[PDB]
Amino acid sequence: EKPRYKDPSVPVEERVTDLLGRMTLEEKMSQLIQGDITNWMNETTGEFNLTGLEWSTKMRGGMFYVGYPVPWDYIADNVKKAQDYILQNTTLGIPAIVQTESLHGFLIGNATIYNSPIGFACSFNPELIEKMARLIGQEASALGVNHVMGPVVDLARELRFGRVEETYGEDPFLAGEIGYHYTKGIQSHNISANVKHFVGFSQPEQGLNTAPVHGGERYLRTTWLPSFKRAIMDAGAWSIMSAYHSYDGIPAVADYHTLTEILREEWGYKYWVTSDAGASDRVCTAFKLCRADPIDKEAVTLAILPAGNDVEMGGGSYNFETIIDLVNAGKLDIEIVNTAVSRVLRAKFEMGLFENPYNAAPASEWNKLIHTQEAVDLARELDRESIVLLENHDNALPLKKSGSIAVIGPMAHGFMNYGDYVVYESQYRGVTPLDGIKAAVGDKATINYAQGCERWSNDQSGFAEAVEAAKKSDVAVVVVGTWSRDQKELWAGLNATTGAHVDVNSLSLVGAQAPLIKAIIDTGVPTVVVLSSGKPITEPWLSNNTAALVQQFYPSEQGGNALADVLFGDYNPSGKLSVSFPHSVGDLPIYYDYLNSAREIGDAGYIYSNGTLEFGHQYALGNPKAWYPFGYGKSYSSFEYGAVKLDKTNVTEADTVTVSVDVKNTDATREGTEVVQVYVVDEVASVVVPNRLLKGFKKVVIPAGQTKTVEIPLKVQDLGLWNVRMKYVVEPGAFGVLVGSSSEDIRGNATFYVQ
Amino acid sequence: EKPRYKDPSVPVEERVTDLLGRMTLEEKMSQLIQGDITNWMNETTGEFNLTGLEWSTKMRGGMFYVGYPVPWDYIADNVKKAQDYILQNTTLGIPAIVQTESLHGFLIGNATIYNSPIGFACSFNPELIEKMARLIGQEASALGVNHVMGPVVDLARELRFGRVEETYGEDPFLAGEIGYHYTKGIQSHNISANVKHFVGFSQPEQGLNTAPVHGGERYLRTTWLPSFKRAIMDAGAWSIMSAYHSYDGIPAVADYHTLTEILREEWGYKYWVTSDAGASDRVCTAFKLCRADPIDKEAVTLAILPAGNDVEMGGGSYNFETIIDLVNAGKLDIEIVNTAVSRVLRAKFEMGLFENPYNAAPASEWNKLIHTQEAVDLARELDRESIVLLENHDNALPLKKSGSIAVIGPMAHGFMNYGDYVVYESQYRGVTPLDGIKAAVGDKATINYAQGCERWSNDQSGFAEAVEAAKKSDVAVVVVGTWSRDQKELWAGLNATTGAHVDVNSLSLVGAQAPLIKAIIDTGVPTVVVLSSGKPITEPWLSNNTAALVQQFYPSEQGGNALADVLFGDYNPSGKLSVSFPHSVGDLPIYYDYLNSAREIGDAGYIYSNGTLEFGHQYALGNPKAWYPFGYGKSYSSFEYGAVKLDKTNVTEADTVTVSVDVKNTDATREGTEVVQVYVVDEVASVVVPNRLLKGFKKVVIPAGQTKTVEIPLKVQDLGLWNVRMKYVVEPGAFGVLVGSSSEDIRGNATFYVQ
């Protein structure tokens, strides 16, 4: 007599079948459309509108967005009102999924802000990233959130595109490892991850946000899909978000081959796909696959729902409201609707929502769960591990805590240089470089600060003050780079050089920043430049014209403390680049995993700083090789690698090859951390393959003078290619194993053979 | 009793069967490998080596290259020796194909040099290009050549790549029309064309010569293949050359899908495919599909010959010498060899070579066939029709033949600015801008010449002389641009900014050229800039800071006379751009036929010349829209278009729609020529398609005040797409017809509907 779907002990598929058979067609439509908390919650006052909750639950009640910059109790209270309404005032009581952003911290004011993804990928520390994700899930779940819109497992393969910072770099393997760990950390709370943006999104034409992508099926399977497969199938993500683009002319939101044939029929994915925000309308408005004005809502629904895009996100025209009419007209098979709903319900059952619909903590516990010291300490630790040392001439770094230090530049103080996907007014809280350097030295050194310039201006009126600061100091630290905006300022249109919908046609420093550096170097004071940015910057004259060069991708709220830890030697920098740096925007793309036959062609030309021209061929007056390659990063210590050893030389597809190498820290006094990287070369292939691929790594702490044996496993099944019949095969033959300190700095090699 | 293959009256397929059944395996191998005239001809002395001819005919005798910078009689005599040896000293007497380059003129000294392809495509005059090709074939056949290595029907879709100049622009339709006409003109002589480079070659990664191409099958079929289909199938080209690249990871030289499934099984191509020069070795050396050192010649042959690449070009390791061993070992089916040989023989029979093996004229007739006044006049006419007027402020142009005129700049005099694929020392003959301007004015104007700068230097020591020339003149013409090299200097490594193996990471003027222009403008003398180049140049400040701006892609030997014809008003410029011009190399790609959802996104930023920054989004500080779009070009006259009329509004796939529009020349006095362009929009599609596509045009001469009715046919069968099943369909629905003066300057529109 009680419904079987309410029984926690019944197998999930039986619960899904029982619930689906009780649902009206309107109740099915409602599970597939995303609502919004502001449908019942006034964003300024927090005041409740029942009529709005009734409508939202009826028409778009399966899940709703909560990413507004409001007090914690507005979110907790109005989420509770929604879950209570569902239980008391609907027949079936299907609990809502409650969605927000988490990219590099729970998107609510005064929560912990971690460094941006492109930066924490430079840690090469997926276990530390899993701890971050567990703390983000702790913070989110405290307020009643049960779904976060991450990770991004897109690859940074088009450096003009504004969302490079949101990715884990250009490499499929590193992005897949980080996405697996991030997904696992979030879902350890029974909160759903949302792997995005499926698939092939982040190589837009011209670098423009949402522009179409040129590519074939071999590139899609070889490069784009692996990070998705690691986060979705291996970590068991409960949801996916499809993308805005077309890939070889098929919209991602309407691609049956990717969303159904690969994702379900090949991989066996069990759960649901949502569109991106207004991605449904784009089928007509951007792609012209239907009438745009007025929008053909039926045509949108008939394109995307049968393709395998189960859920329509807000931000569009709510085209799926046509489902009732389409099923009643015989234009849409009820089985397609039932499959979509089943996917959403399956995730909600497995998450535990029917047994625990509202997971918020009481108000008295929020300060014990959100912005804890454990989370702030982890923010500092992970930021510190992400900093990449690019140059260090004649032991300029680390700095002594003595004498006088100039701290110069627009990114040194006055605002926090956060990446995108932070809440409004975040930039007014956190540790700046100046704050961290002043705290580090105390009364032992004099700090001479000068802004030098505004990041958004070519005005040089601040230079004389900065030159005076440098001249009165023993060393100068100059902090410059790119900037983004928070989730109100970005969409209001305030100036930026990176972030969603902020694309660039140049990677050089903007405004007076490069001339500011030149003015300080020209004092003859040793000058340490810190790049504070969301993507590569092209200024190759910095490598040999400064005393040291440090990369800190957009910081955590502890950014200046992490930076001072490295600058003063309390931490030996250990980061390695997650993305290759070109010499110029004219040299793109620059990824390290180019196909054999790319990049290494001919001789490069050069333009001397005095204007002399030295003509070459690839290019006439420039260089297509990376300025700094994927995996690059220096240390205050030096590392010497021994002979590479394999445990097995003659293997099957079924085998694991363990790579062993002894690494010695040859420094006289300082412990350091090395990221040992393993690149695999498929020496002879039946189709053209990537020249080399990262397939393992290990980050190892090595005391001064000590030797550590580093072991890295290679699963042979993971080393295959997509052959001329579009089948995945590990072909018999030789595989080279290249071991070293970057994708170019190879210190040893070995070979094994697949039979 | 006499062999059937010798009977001219026997059907070609019976001749092929009879000859093939008489051939040894070595004789079959020899038809599939390209020899070289220098195997028997000393390039310096012309002296004959019989032993060399015997070997070359035995091992690689089907065809041979003759592109060396030698006297006419060296070519004629040593070709005759080869054809005579074949007839007297081989069993079967299979006549040789005799190959050279023809791109923009027969590649031998003192033959007619036409303007480069990217330039003559701006004529939008395929009938005039067919007359050029007929004259190139007259010149080549005079010396015993029977095969030319063109046309290039690649598209200029990557502006960094050095071979943009060799193409007919970025548009499939225009490139297909020109390639059809060029092929037809050559083959009217019973000389074979060689359509190249099949397929998808000219979008290399990073812009680098021979680098791999990312793209899908829909892009390949939609954009890359159509120009090939027009030149190959509609004009009946007797040969094709495959390319150096990989496309989505399949080498073009080893692609069974393109070379066999599309080219033969879909299209029904009857003839042969050659590799490019050393393209066979690349299967191992660049693509790593086999051992490189020592080269696995068997593996190369097993990859490319069965794929459909019949003939191995010289410049590699002559891998096909393994055919005998491979057939004898049972590794290569004799039927694959027999099919390849049959394709070569079929072309040789159809050409008429067995009846006429040596087509050279006698020496007494060479000056009546090569470099005739008819050919030189056509060179001037076609060059003049190719010049594009970009700007003309306040009737600066045309110039009067009075007063004083300054002629300034590195490209104004001292060398001819020819494109690539000219013979060694060509640059010392032809009409420079200065030569043409001095000839035009005679004693009616004073010409003040100054070089101003060297194209390859930032030295400004010549500026004072040029400023003095400008100040003493009423108007200044400044000639700058890019440069290439001839077929000895290019491969010797001399400096260049365009041409095969000369790729660039910037499109801005090189060296002191832009500062030279600024120095002349700053005199206050009206300044007319002529861009003399092989591809777009990015200098947007020229549009509104000069008096006039003229584009002349690399000239003919009559270049300065054609330029003076336009500058002084004897010809009203009529060219339209074959390729879109971006604002910056950071904005690429820039083709006009982008897919719906590309390019038109968001708001553009700007950097003022005073350094003020104006932030946008696409891009933060730049503009992804073209500076000048495909099809752009001004006139001294103005044109007013009437209403667009269609003869039929309701059509089938079988129908032709004729577009009619009245065009009036509204100038007070001057006749002018307009290129009326017709763009088709498929308003609603089942897959994402190009936003608009050129599908017809007509170049029309209109006297001042006159109205002409222009009629352009559209074959509805040509307006389809490649659907989600990769089938070509013309889908029922609306097609917009946009008529105008460029791809952006649309003056009228109409709609028809397919049933």
Ligand SMILES: OC[C@H]1O[C@@H](O)[C@H](O)[C@@H](O)[C@@H]1O[C@@H]1O[C@H](CO[C@H]2OC[C@@H](O)[C@H](O)[C@H]2O)[C@@H](O[C@@H]2O[C@H](CO[C@H]3OC[C@@H](O)[C@H](O)[C@H]3O)[C@@H](O[C@@H]3O[C@H](CO[C@H]4OC[C@@H](O)[C@H](O)[C@H]4O)[C@@H](O)[C@H](O)[C@H]3O)[C@H](O)[C@H]2O)[C@H](O)[C@H]1O
């Ligand atoms: O109306 C124009 C303009 O008016 C001004 O008055 C106002 O200041 C602007 O806000 C406004 O623009 C719209 O703003 C919102 C964000 O609004 C905040 O600012 C005002 C505050 O008062 C308010 O509290 C805030 O809500 C933008 O939202 C962003 O939308 C993008 C997608 O939209 C962009 O990208 C695609 C392109 O096609 C569009 O034209 C472009 O604008 C999101 O991008 C995807 O979003 C999802 C998250 O979705 C969630 O937020 C959006 C919502 O509709 C949906 O229901 C939610 O689930 C990510 O997970 C994906 O990774 C990402 O790809 C942004 O996150 C989102 O914040 C509007 O775009 C804008 O028009």
Ligand SMILES: OC[C@H]1O[C@@H](O)[C@H](O)[C@@H](O)[C@@H]1O[C@@H]1O[C@H](CO[C@H]2OC[C@@H](O)[C@H](O)[C@H]2O)[C@@H](O[C@@H]2O[C@H](CO[C@H]3OC[C@@H](O)[C@H](O)[C@H]3O)[C@@H](O[C@@H]3O[C@H](CO[C@H]4OC[C@@H](O)[C@H](O)[C@H]4O)[C@@H](O)[C@H](O)[C@H]3O)[C@H](O)[C@H]2O)[C@H](O)[C@H]1O
């Ligand atoms: O050995 C290095 C260097 O030594 C110096 O001493 C010398 O000055 C250089 O010549 C030399 O380099 C080689 O030069 C030849 C051209 O040689 C001329 O200059 C010297 C003169 O004394 C002599 O009479 C001349 O022959 C180059 O030839 C060009 O080759 C390219 C292809 O090679 C390039 O592109 C691919 C890349 O993989 C290579 O590394 C790169 O060098 C042609 O490109 C294709 O060629 C065909 C035409 O083929 C015909 O010419 C080449 C020949 O082997 C073949 O048998 C012929 O059919 C075009 O139709 C295609 O469109 C194009 O894609 C050039 O046309 C060709 O002139 C050598 O590359 C170079 O190594």
Ligand SMILES: *[C@@H]1O[C@H](CO)[C@@H](O[C@@H]2O[C@H](CO)[C@@H](O)[C@H](O)[C@H]2NC(C)=O)[C@H](O)[C@H]1NC(C)=O
């Ligand atoms: C970029 O945005 C900043 C705001 O972040 C603008 O800064 C304001 O500029 C005016 C005059 O330029 C000042 O009086 C305000 O005090 C500025 N605010 C801050 C926080 O500095 C800046 O003008 C914008 N720049 C451009 C070029 O758009």
Ligand SMILES: *[C@@H]1O[C@H](CO)[C@@H](O[C@@H]2O[C@H](CO)[C@@H](O)[C@H](O)[C@H]2NC(C)=O)[C@H](O)[C@H]1NC(C)=O
């Ligand atoms: C580019 O190539 C030209 C040859 O075309 C070089 O010109 C020679 O330069 C030397 C000294 O620079 C002169 O003495 C010769 O007279 C020049 N020859 C000509 C024909 O002008 C030029 O040097 C090269 N430039 C670079 C930067 O490589």
Ligand SMILES: O[C@@H]1[C@@H](O)[C@H](O)O[C@H](CO[C@H]2OC[C@@H](O)[C@H](O)[C@H]2O)[C@H]1O
């Ligand atoms: O200061 C450390 C040294 O102690 C260690 O021995 O070498 C490191 C690497 O320095 C090289 O790479 C960076 C360049 O900028 C240097 O000039 C090189 O010696 C240093 O950080």
Ligand SMILES: O[C@@H]1[C@@H](O)[C@H](O)O[C@H](CO[C@H]2OC[C@@H](O)[C@H](O)[C@H]2O)[C@H]1O
């Ligand atoms: O000189 C002719 C005029 O006679 C004709 O009337 O307009 C033409 C086009 O000029 C426009 O386009 C080019 C820009 O540079 C001008 O400023 C525009 O008026 C002229 O060539």
Ligand SMILES: *[C@@H]1O[C@H](CO)[C@@H](O)[C@H](O)[C@H]1NC(C)=O
């Ligand atoms: C939210 O509250 C304020 C009143 O204090 C109001 O100005 C605004 O209109 C309200 N928003 C909505 C959509 O009712």
Ligand SMILES: *[C@@H]1O[C@H](CO)[C@@H](O)[C@H](O)[C@H]1NC(C)=O
């Ligand atoms: C309350 O919500 C209903 C239904 O969406 C809406 O019509 C009404 O305008 C809302 N009132 C306020 C004050 O926002």
Ligand SMILES: *[C@@H]1O[C@H](CO)[C@@H](O)[C@H](O)[C@H]1NC(C)=O
């Ligand atoms: C249920 O709806 C009734 C109005 O019909 C309302 O009085 C009651 O507060 C609602 N309860 C919840 C928990 O939403």
Ligand SMILES: *[C@@H]1O[C@H](CO)[C@@H](O)[C@H](O)[C@H]1NC(C)=O
């Ligand atoms: C959390 O999710 C797992 C996996 O579906 C499930 O087994 C478990 O019961 C869930 N826990 C709760 C408390 O709902």
Ligand SMILES: *[C@@H]1O[C@H](CO)[C@@H](O)[C@H](O)[C@H]1NC(C)=O
């Ligand atoms: C800086 O110096 C070293 C010279 O030892 C060199 O390897 C590197 O290429 C130089 N970097 C740049 C950007 O010029």
Ligand SMILES: *[C@@H]1O[C@H](CO)[C@@H](O)[C@H](O)[C@H]1NC(C)=O
């Ligand atoms: C510029 O620097 C180069 C390289 O050191 C040198 O060869 C050249 O002579 C210098 N040029 C000038 C014009 O000073």
Ligand SMILES: *[C@@H]1O[C@H](CO)[C@@H](O)[C@H](O)[C@H]1NC(C)=O
């Ligand atoms: C061609 O002739 C000249 C002799 O005048 C000679 O120097 C050169 O070696 C000859 N070439 C060959 C390959 O024999």
Ligand SMILES: *[C@@H]1O[C@H](CO)[C@@H](O)[C@H](O)[C@H]1NC(C)=O
């Ligand atoms: C003549 O050709 C033969 C065969 O290729 C070659 O061995 C011999 O060296 C050549 N002699 C000259 C003078 O080039």
Ligand SMILES: *[C@@H]1O[C@H](CO)[C@@H](O)[C@H](O)[C@H]1NC(C)=O
């Ligand atoms: C044929 O070969 C013989 C040498 O065996 C030679 O004497 C004769 O000149 C050759 N004839 C021709 C036309 O090549």
Ligand SMILES: *[C@@H]1O[C@H](CO)[C@@H](O)[C@H](O)[C@H]1NC(C)=O
């Ligand atoms: C020229 O080619 C055509 C087409 O194959 C052929 O019909 C004709 O006989 C040829 N003419 C000569 C003189 O060989």
